[PDB]
Amino acid sequence: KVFGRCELAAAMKRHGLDNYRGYSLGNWVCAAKFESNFNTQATNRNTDGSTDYGILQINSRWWCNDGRTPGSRNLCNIPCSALLSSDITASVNCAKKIVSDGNGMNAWVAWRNRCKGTDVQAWIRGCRL
DSSP states (O other): OBOOHHHHHHHHHHTTOTTBTTBOHHHHHHHHHHHHTTBSSOEEEOSSSOEEETTTTEETTTTOBOSSOTTOOOSSOSBGGGGGSSOOHHHHHHHHHHTTTSSGGGGSHHHHHHTTTSOGGGGSTTOOO
């Protein structure tokens, strides 16, 4: 499924992500936007086997097993594919362990380059939250 700006905002909140590790909800909506485009199915291969899956584009060399990325430790202990379903529990759930290992949302190339230090609040303006 491909989420609505507003809509995904809400969803992620229901699920504990607002100020999770002190990261505003906007950080999260902005990140997923430029990262996956509100599309939970999206997938992406980088050059080293590794692939990126779902709304928050979590990698497979560390977070989820996908059966074809050898370097794999399955720290999220979920099969990559689970991350693509129209239900972001797994992702959000897994996303929480990436945000807390140590590099905040810096672990996400995108938020950093295009979200980090912009007024992320405008992402959730107009939202009934």
